Design a protein around this ligand. Structure first.
Ligand SMILES: Nc1ncnc2c1ncn2[C@@H]1O[C@H](COP(=O)(O)OP(=O)(O)NP(=O)(O)O)[C@@H](O)[C@H]1O
Length: 821
């Protein structure tokens, strides 16, 4: 059933006796010192001045766009303006306001900020609360504001597709162009025709907010103006000159291989622009030598385009602290790895270890609230340094920021449709992002923004980042569209504000079919309904889903985490060869790059029990990035409580013993890997080591692979996750599997005979010898599992592996028996 439907399932029932209660409470608030102090902060915001022009536009029209500068008050104020208007007109009980957020933490932290501005507690029957998935602090039924995530709304449309209890819906941060926000807009636009009463407010940062107006039929639009002080900008040349930066010698040595050998993408029109860059480079350097010292130019020539130089940021921070006037510094970094690294770099220095600095890492997976004291002001003499990702570009505003360090990089998903490769990587900011970052420094006074890219690069940046719909694989979206009965997949996507390419759509639908999430009429299978309940890429979904079904949870979640993000191995330059020997050491006899990660991870936990010296000694002698290991560990946790939500495990812990009974069985883990990586399958050529593919002919093994020199495989088949082309095609990480694993989790099953041999074909190209009875057997077992999955839709509960006679243990045990041939 559904546990997060309670604010939605209450009926909107206005009550004049509550209309009076809310208005009397409104004037007792006016006497409360906590309340008046918060009101003095609110009147300073530009939104306050426009308070009633905004509410008149909202009240006269059904769809409204509100643009404004960042920090003007959109997220925290507009809901209050609506609610307080209805209160003041004695119509308070009629207000049920829903405000969608892009991230859980936003929903929570905003609800808590708003509740303290109303001088109330959050939830507990007061005016404001939040609902995220699995966790809520709900306000009262009527006259209330609810902060939720777009994910919640999408679940809500399963039980009430008209959202009839809700009076006003506010779509926040829509300029971020998240997938979910983009489809929600399209759903909402069609809803308007059936809900005369419903009011919709779209809230966007100023840039291109007209586009949303035009998608909605040229709805009214209103801009909240703000003032930003002028900001001095600096490119890399300027920073290098100002601080006379010199990279370290003894630090930089034994540099960490990447590009092809750690598996990067290098798409089509990045290379076209990068051909422009290397052609304009000599002329740019010669020019620079006229305006900058020789040493500045010598350093810049040597700068690495791939990584953010965290030592330069550390230097630059130190210069600002010592040479510039008071003011908080804000640092923009691509992701969590760099944030914690920079943090550790700073506080490895005795200067910053003082109480005259407040150094705050800030990111979306951060615990609790933003109550971390990001917002609190520093007394004179103490300097606040905030190290963040792009969520401080628009979602969050720190008022006292005066210096902004823009690392120049942002993490983007990307998807190449011609060779069918989906990557995530650090990419250059756009001009639009760079302009938003610069503005965070002009909020209270004249500021400074230091961009870590050179003049040549600045001129070649893209003007805007592309919406995720145009660069992200579409499989999760497509499951949402059918679970919501929105109709044809391709047809619906074509109606989006920015419709995806048709090849992206066809590739995603094919993938869901090969995964058995859709049948060949493009309709949900029992398995697909469960995959849609998981907020992960479906292939990762199927794998972690079966890791719970087959009771091998802990190693599966590890592999799933590494496929989702990346493996923990690093190769220092020149140390390639002995690093390969340690990798194949961890491989033991598995013939599996995936079980290597598992062995490396399991070794790491037992090593961290034995103390730092033995743990650091481990990551060193076996070449693991302990930073990477930690995030994988944390993704394991997330995957677990994903499973907890869908009802497949009874606990939030991945090492829970009841879900781990088969975790030491190599055959079974390999079956589960196969569940998620099919149809990427290769047939090994018998006695260079090369393998046949359905896609690409004869291909080779990537040299990082524990199977690259291997000639004693014990089965004929491999599965791989990542394939990449340079001069030819190479498989990155592969795992030898039995034909019986393919036969169960694979495509359509067919039988051939003639005179000589009994043959089973899977998807017609995968052909092995075995008796025809086994084919009828797997046909039967597949249908029994389908019904196990169907009947766990309506009341999901984890399989109990301690019950003998279950009819779920019976079928899965039979399936386990079959894949153990
Ligand atoms: N948790 C908080 N604690 C203190 N001040 C806050 C908090 N959240 C926001 N503010 C302040 O509230 C003001 C407006 O913030 P906010 O309402 O998010 O503006 P906005 O950028 O227009 N809305 P949005 O960009 O959509 O999130 C700024 O001065 C912020 O510093």
């Amino acid at each position: 059933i559904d546990r997060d439907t309670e604010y939605l399932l209450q009926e909107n029932e206005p009550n004049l006796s509550l209309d009076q209660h809310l208005l009397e409470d409104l004037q007792r608030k006016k006497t409360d010192p906590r309340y008046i102090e918060m009101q003095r902060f609110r009147k300073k915001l530009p939104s306050y001045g426009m308070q009633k022009e905004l509410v008149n536009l909202i009240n006269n029209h059904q769809v409204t766009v509100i643009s404004g500068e960042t920090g003007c008050g959109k997220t925290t104020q507009v809901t209050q303006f609506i609610l307080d208007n209805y209160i003041e007109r004695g119509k308070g009980s009629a207000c049920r306001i829903v405000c969608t957020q892009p991230r859980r933490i936003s929903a929570i932290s905003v609800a808590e900020r708003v509740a303290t501005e109303r001088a109330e507690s959050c939830g507990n029957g007061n005016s404001t609360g939040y609902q995220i998935r699995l966790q809520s602090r709900l306000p009262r039924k009527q006259g209330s504001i609810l902060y939720c995530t777009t994910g919640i709304i999408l679940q809500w449309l399963q039980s009430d597709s008209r959202l009839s209890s809700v009076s006003h819906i506010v779509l926040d941060e829509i300029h971020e162009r998240n997938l979910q926000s983009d489809v929600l807009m399209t759903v909402i636009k069609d809803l308007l025709h059936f809900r005369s009463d419903l009011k919709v407010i779209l809230m966007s940062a100023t840039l291109n907010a007209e586009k949303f107006s035009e998608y909605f039929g040229n709805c009214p639009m209103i801009h909240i103006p703000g003032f930003t002080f002028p900001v001095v900008e600096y490119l890399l040349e300027d920073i290098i000159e100002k601080i006379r930066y010199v990279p370290d010698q003894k630090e930089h040595r034994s540099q960490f291989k990447r590009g092809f050998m750690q598996g990067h993408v290098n798409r089509q029109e990045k290379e076209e622009k990068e051909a422009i860059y290397k052609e304009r480079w000599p002329a740019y350097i010669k020019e620079l030598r006229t305006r900058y010292s020789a040493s500045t130019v010598d350093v810049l020539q040597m700068m690495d385009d791939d990584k953010v130089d965290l030592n330069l940021i550390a230097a630059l921070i130190r210069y600002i602290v010592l040479e510039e006037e008071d003011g908080a510094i804000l640092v923009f970094l691509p992701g969590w790895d760099n944030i914690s690294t920079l943090h550790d770099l700073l506080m490895s220095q005795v200067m910053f270890k003082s109480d005259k600095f407040l150094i705050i890492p800030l990111h979306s997976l951060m615990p609790t609230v933003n109550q971390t004291q990001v917002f609190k002001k520093t007394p004179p003499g103490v300097r606040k340094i905030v190290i963040a990702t792009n969520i401080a570009e628009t979602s969050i505003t720190i008022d006292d920021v005066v210096y902004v360090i823009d690392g120049g990089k942002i993490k983007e998903t990307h998807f190449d449709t011609q060779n069918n490769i989906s990557t995530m990587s650090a990419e250059w900011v756009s001009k639009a992002n760079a302009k938003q970052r610069k503005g965070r420094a002009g909020r209270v006074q004249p500021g400074h923004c230091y961009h870590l890219y050179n003049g040549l690069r600045a001129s070649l940046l893209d003007d805007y980042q592309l919406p995720e719909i145009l660069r992200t694989p579409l499989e999760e979206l497509c499951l949402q569209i059918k679970i919501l009965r929105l109709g044809g997949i391709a047809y619906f996507l074509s109606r989006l504000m920015d419709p995806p390419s048709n090849e992206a759509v066809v590739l995603s639908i094919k993938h869901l079919m090969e995964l058995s999430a859709l049948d060949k009429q493009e309709e949900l299978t029992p398995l697909g309904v469960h995959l849609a309940r998981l907020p992960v890429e479906p292939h990762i979904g199927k794998m972690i889903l079966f890791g719970a079904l087959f009771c091998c949870l802990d190693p599966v979640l590890t592999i799933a985490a590494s496929l989702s993000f990346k493996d923990p191995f690093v190769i220092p330059l020149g140390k390639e060869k002995i690093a390969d020997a340690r990798r194949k050491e961890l491989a033991k006899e598995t013939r599996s790059d995936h079980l290597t990660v598992v062995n490396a991870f399991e070794g790491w936990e037992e090593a961290k029990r034995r103390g730092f010296r033995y743990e650091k000694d481990y990551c060193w002698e076996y070449f693991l990035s302990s930073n990477t290991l930690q995030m994988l560990h944390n993704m394991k946790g997330q995957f677990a409580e994903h499973l907890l939500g869908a009802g497949f495990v009874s606990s939030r812990s991945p090492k829970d013993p009841k879900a781990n009974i088969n975790s030491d069985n190599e055959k079974i883990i390999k079956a589960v890997i196969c569940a998620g990586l099919y149809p990427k399958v290769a047939k090994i050529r018998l006695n260079m080591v090369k393998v046949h593919t359905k896609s690409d002919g004869l291909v080779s093994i990537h040299p990082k692979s524990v199977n690259v020199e291997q000639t004693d495989f014990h089965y004929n088949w491999l599965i791989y996750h990542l394939k990449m082309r340079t001069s030819s095609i190479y498989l990155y990480d592969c795992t030898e599997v039995s034909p019986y694993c393919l036969l169960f989790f694979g495509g359509d099953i067919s039988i051939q005979k003639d005179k000589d041999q009994e043959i089973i074909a899977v998807d017609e190209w995968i052909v092995f010898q075995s008796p025809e009875r086994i084919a009828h057997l797997v046909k039967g077992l597949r249908k029994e599992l389908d019904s196990l999955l169907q009947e766990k839709i309506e009341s999901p509960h984890p399989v109990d592996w301690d019950d003998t006679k279950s009819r779920d243990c019976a079928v899965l045990s039979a399936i386990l028996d079959l894949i153990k041939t």
